[PDB]
Amino acid sequence: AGPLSGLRVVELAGIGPGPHAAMILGDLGADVVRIDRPISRDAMLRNRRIVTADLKSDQGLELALKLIAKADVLIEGYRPGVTERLGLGPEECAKVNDRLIYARMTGWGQTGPRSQQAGHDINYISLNGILHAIGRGDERPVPPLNLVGDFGGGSMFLLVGILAALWERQSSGKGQVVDAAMVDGSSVLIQMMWAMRATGMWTDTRGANMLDGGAPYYDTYECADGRYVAVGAIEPQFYAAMLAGLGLDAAELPPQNDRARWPELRALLTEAFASHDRDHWGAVFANSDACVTPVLAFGEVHNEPHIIERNTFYEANGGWQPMPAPRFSRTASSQPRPPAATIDIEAVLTDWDG
Amino acid sequence: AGPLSGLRVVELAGIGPGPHAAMILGDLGADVVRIDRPISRDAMLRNRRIVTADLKSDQGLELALKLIAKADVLIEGYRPGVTERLGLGPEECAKVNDRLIYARMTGWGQTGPRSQQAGHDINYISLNGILHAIGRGDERPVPPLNLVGDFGGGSMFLLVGILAALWERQSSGKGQVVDAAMVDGSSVLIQMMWAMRATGMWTDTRGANMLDGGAPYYDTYECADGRYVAVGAIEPQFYAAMLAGLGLDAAELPPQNDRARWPELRALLTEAFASHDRDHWGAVFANSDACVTPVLAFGEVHNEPHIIERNTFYEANGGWQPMPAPRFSRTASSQPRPPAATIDIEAVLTDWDG
Ligand SMILES: CC(=O)SCCNC(=O)CCNC(=O)[C@H](O)C(C)(C)COP(=O)(O)OP(=O)(O)OC[C@H]1O[C@@H](n2cnc3c(N)ncnc32)[C@H](O)[C@@H]1OP(=O)(O)O
Ligand SMILES: CC(=O)SCCNC(=O)CCNC(=O)[C@H](O)C(C)(C)COP(=O)(O)OP(=O)(O)OC[C@H]1O[C@@H](n2cnc3c(N)ncnc32)[C@H](O)[C@@H]1OP(=O)(O)O
Numbered sequence: 001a002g003p004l005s006g007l008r009v010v011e012l013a014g015i016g017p018g019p020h021a022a023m024i025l026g027d028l029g030a031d032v033v034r035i036d037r038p039i040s041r042d043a044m045l046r047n048r049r050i051v052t053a054d055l056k057s058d059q060g061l062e063l064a065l066k067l068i069a070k071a072d073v074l075i076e077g078y079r080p081g082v083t084e085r086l087g088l089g090p091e092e093c094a095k096v097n098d099r100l101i102y103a104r105m106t107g108w109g110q111t112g113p114r115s116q117q118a119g120h121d122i123n124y125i126s127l128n129g130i131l132h133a134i135g136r137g138d139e140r141p142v143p144p145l146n147l148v149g150d151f152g153g154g155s156m157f158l159l160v161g162i163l164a165a166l167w168e169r170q171s172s173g174k175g176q177v178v179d180a181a182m183v184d185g186s187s188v189l190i191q192m193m194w195a196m197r198a199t200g201m202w203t204d205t206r207g208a209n210m211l212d213g214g215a216p217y218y219d220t221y222e223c224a225d226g227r228y229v230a231v232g233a234i235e236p237q238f239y240a241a242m243l244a245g246l247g248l249d250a251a252e253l254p255p256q257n258d259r260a261r262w263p264e265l266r267a268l269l270t271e272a273f274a275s276h277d278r279d280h281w282g283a284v285f286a287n288s289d290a291c292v293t294p295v296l297a298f299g300e301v302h303n304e305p306h307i308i309e310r311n312t313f314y315e316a317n318g319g320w321q322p323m324p325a326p327r328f329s330r331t332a333s334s335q336p337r338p339p340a341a342t343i344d345i346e347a348v349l350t351d352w353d354g
Numbered sequence: 355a356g357p358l359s360g361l362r363v364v365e366l367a368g369i370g371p372g373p374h375a376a377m378i379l380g381d382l383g384a385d386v387v388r389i390d391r392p393i394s395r396d397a398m399l400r401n402r403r404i405v406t407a408d409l410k411s412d413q414g415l416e417l418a419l420k421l422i423a424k425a426d427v428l429i430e431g432y433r434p435g436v437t438e439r440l441g442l443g444p445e446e447c448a449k450v451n452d453r454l455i456y457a458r459m460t461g462w463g464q465t466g467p468r469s470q471q472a473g474h475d476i477n478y479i480s481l482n483g484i485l486h487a488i489g490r491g492d493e494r495p496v497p498p499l500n501l502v503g504d505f506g507g508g509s510m511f512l513l514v515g516i517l518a519a520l521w522e523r524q525s526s527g528k529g530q531v532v533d534a535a536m537v538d539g540s541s542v543l544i545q546m547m548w549a550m551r552a553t554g555m556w557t558d559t560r561g562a563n564m565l566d567g568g569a570p571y572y573d574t575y576e577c578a579d580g581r582y583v584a585v586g587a588i589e590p591q592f593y594a595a596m597l598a599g600l601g602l603d604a605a606e607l608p609p610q611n612d613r614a615r616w617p618e619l620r621a622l623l624t625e626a627f628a629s630h631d632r633d634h635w636g637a638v639f640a641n642s643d644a645c646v647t648p649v650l651a652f653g654e655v656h657n658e659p660h661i662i663e664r665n666t667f668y669e670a671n672g673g674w675q676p677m678p679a680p681r682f683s684r685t686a687s688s689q690p691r692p693p694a695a696t697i698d699i700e701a702v703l704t705d706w707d708g
Pocket of ligand 2: 369389390407409410431433439459460461471473474504
C-alpha cells in the first residue's frame with residue numbers, strides 16, 4: 001500500500017541490520033520473502049512471508065535460485081564468501097537474473113584484513129572514531145546501543161544502496177551489487193564531526209564538545225523527582241527563552257558560549273532544574289522555543305500527546321511498536337502485518353509465477 | 355558517476371538532516387543544486403552547485419519555481435508552514451511539476467501539538483524513549499551526539515523516503531510529499547528495543563541491558579595506557595575466544611549470562627584488560643573472532659590498516675573525510691567534489707534547459 005508496493009525482495013535470514021532493512025522495505029509495501037534454516041514473537045519480523053530451506057541441499061539451492069530469479073532485491077548478511085560457497089553468490093545469481101539488486105550487509109565490508117572477522121555494532125564503531133566520542137569525559141566510552149553501526153550506519157545505508165540501484169536500473173535495465181559495510185555507513189553518518197574537526201569546531205576530547213554533553217545548553221538535567229529533561233537550546237533566542245522559563249536573569253549568568261565558565265553555567269542550570277519535577281518543566285516550557293523537553297522512558301512514550309496525536313506507534317500483542325517511517329501523502333504505508341506462520345515455498349513460487 | 359547520476363535535486367539551505375541527506379544524494383551521483391540566502395569550508399557541502407536567492411522577493415520566488423519545475427526532488431527542512439508562506443509549498447510546486455518528490459525534513463513532523471516548536475536532535479530522541487536508554491545507569495542520560503535523531507532517524511529516512519517515492523513514480527508517473535520526522539525515523543531505527551521489550555528481552559533501566567553497556571561482554575574496557583578496547587563477544591564461541599586471548603580459565607569465572615554475577619565477571623575482565631596497553635590487546639586480538647577491537651580516536655583512524663586498505667576516507671583540504679557509502683560494483687561513486695564558489699542561478703537553469 002506504500003510507495004514500494006510491487007517490489008520483490010528475497011531476504012536470507014540473518015541478524016541485526018539485514019532483517020531491519022528488510023522490515024523497512026516491507027513497511028513501505030514491498031513483497032518481502034524471508035528464507036530461514038529448516039509463528040514468531042519478534043515484531044522485527046513484521047511484513048514478511050516466511051519460508052524455510054536448507055540452502056546446503058540441492059533442492060534448497062534450486063528452490064532459492066528459482067525464488068531469486070523472480071525477485072528485484074536479494075538481502076544477505078553473512079560473512080563474505082558464505083553465499084559464494086552456497087552457490088548463491090552474485091555471479092551465480094547473475095546467471096538467472098541480471099536485474100537483481102544484490103545487497104550485501106556487513107560490518108567490515110567484502111574485502112580487507114578484517115573482512116573475515118566476527119564482530120558486532122560496538123566493534124565497527126570502535127575502529128572509526130565514533131565510540132571514543134560517546135559518553136562522559138571522565139569515563140570509558142559508552143555504546144549508543146546498536147543504533148549507530150547496525151541501524152543508522154548499517155541497515156539505513158543498505159536501503160539507500162538498494163533504492164539507489166533500483167533508480168539506476170530504470171535507465172540501464174540491470175542490477176548490480178551493493179556493498180554495505182557498517183564501518184563505511186557509520187563514517188558517512190558521522191560526516192558532520194569530520195567536517196567540524198577540519199575547521200576547529202570539534203575535538204577528539206570526549207564530552208567536551210557542543211553536542212556530546214559538554215555544552216550546558218545541550219545536555220540532560222536531573223529534576224526534583226530524579227527524572228530528566230533534555231535541553232537543546234543552541235541558538236541564542238532559544239537559550240534566552242530557556243532562561244526566561246527558569247526565571248534566570250541573563251545578566252547574572254556567564255555568557256552562553258564562554259567555555260571557561262561552562263562549569264559555573266552548568267551548576268546554575270542544574271540548581272534551577274533540580275528545583276521542580278520534569279512535569280513542571282513541560283508545563284513551564286509548553287509552546288515555547290526553549291528546546292526543553294521531558295526525557296521519557298519507553299514505557300511512558302504512549303501517554304505523550306504529540307506521540308499519540310501523530311500515531312507514531314501502534315499496539316501489537318505484547319505492546320507498542322513504531323509505525324512505518326517516513327510518511328507519504330499519496331501512497332501511505334499500511335499498519336504492519338504481524339509475524340505469521342511459515343508458508344510453503346512452492347506457494348510463493350506460483351504466486352510470483354516462477 | 356554513482357547510481358544516482360541523472361537525478362535532479364533542489365535543496366533549500368537548512369541545517370542538520372537536510373544538508374546531510376542532500377550530501378548523500380550528491381555523493382551517489384545526483385545533480386544537487388542548493389539555494390541559500392543572499393566558497394565554503396564546510397565539507398558537508400561537498401557535491402553541490404551553490405546558488406543564492408531571496409525567496410521572499412518576486413524575482414527569487416520566480417527563479418526558484420523555475421528551478422523546481424525542472425527537478426526530481428525538493429528538500430526543505432524548515433518549520434511546517436514556512437515553504438507555504440513563501441509560495442513554495444507542495445500545492446504550489448505541484449502546479450509547475452507534479453513529478454516532484456517533495457521531501458520535508460522535520461523533528462516533530464508536519465502536524466501535532468509540537469510541530470511549531472523549536473528543537474534539536476536531543477529533544478526529538480528525548481520524547482520517544484531513546485535518550486533515556488543511553489548512558490550509564492548511575493548517571494543522567496548522555497546524548498549519542500546527534501547521530502540518532504538528525505542522521506540515523508532523520509536524514510537516512512528522508513533518503514529512503516525520497517528513493518522509495520522515485521520507485522513509485524515509475525509506475526504512476528507522479529511524485530508526492532515525503533513527511534520525514536526525526537521523532538518517527540528514530541523510533542523505527544530503535545524498533546529492535548521495542549520488539550525486545552514486548553518479549554522480556556529489554557528493560558527500561560538504563561545501563562542494565564545486553565547492548566547498552568550493562569553486559570560485561572558488550573562494553574569498553576580501559577587498558578594499562580588509559581586507552582580502551584571494545585568487547586562485542588555475544589555468542590558463546592566468540593566469548594570463549596575472547597577468554598582464551600585473555601588467558602582466562604572459564605572454569606574459574608562465572609557463567610557468561612549469569613546476570614547475578616555480572617559485577618564479579620566484569621571485575622575479572624577489567625583486571626585482565628588493565629594489565630596491558632590497548633595495542634597489545636590490539637595485537638593479541640587483531641586476527642580472531644573474540645570481537646575485541648581497539649577504540650580509536652578520530653585522529654588515529656587514518657592509520658588503521660583495515661580503514662586504509664578499503665579507502666573509507668580521503669583527505670580533503672586539511673583533514674580526512676568519509677568516502678561515499680554504500681558501495682556499488684557497476685556504477686561506483688566518485689571521490690566527492692569539494693565545496694566551490696557560488697554560481698549564478700541562470701547558468702544552472704540553461705544547463706537544466708529550463
Ligand atoms: C543484532 C546484532 O547484534 S548483529 C551485529 C551485526 N553483525 C553482523 O551481522 C555482521 C556481518 N556478519 C558476520 O560477521 C557473521 O555472519 C556473524 C559474526 C554475525 C556470524 O558468524 P558465523 O555465524 O560464524 O558465520 P556466518 O554467518 O558467516 O556463516 C553462516 C553459516 O550458516 C549457513 N547457512 C545460512 N543459512 C542457511 C540455510 N537456510 N540452510 C543451511 N545453511 C545455512 C551458511 O552457509 C554459513 O555456513 P558456513 O560457515 O559453513 O559457510
Ligand atoms: C546541527 C543541528 O543540531 S540542527 C538540528 C536539526 N533539527 C532541527 O533544527 C529541526 C528543523 N526544523 C525546524 O524546526 C526549524 O527550521 C528550526 C527550529 C531549526 C529553525 O527555525 P527558525 O530559524 O526559527 O526559522 P524557520 O525554519 O521557522 O523559518 C525559516 C525562515 O527563513 C526564511 N527563509 C528561508 N529561506 C529563505 C531565502 N532563500 N530567502 C529569504 N528568506 C528565507 C523563511 O521565510 C522563514 O521565515 P518566516 O518564519 O518569517 O517565514
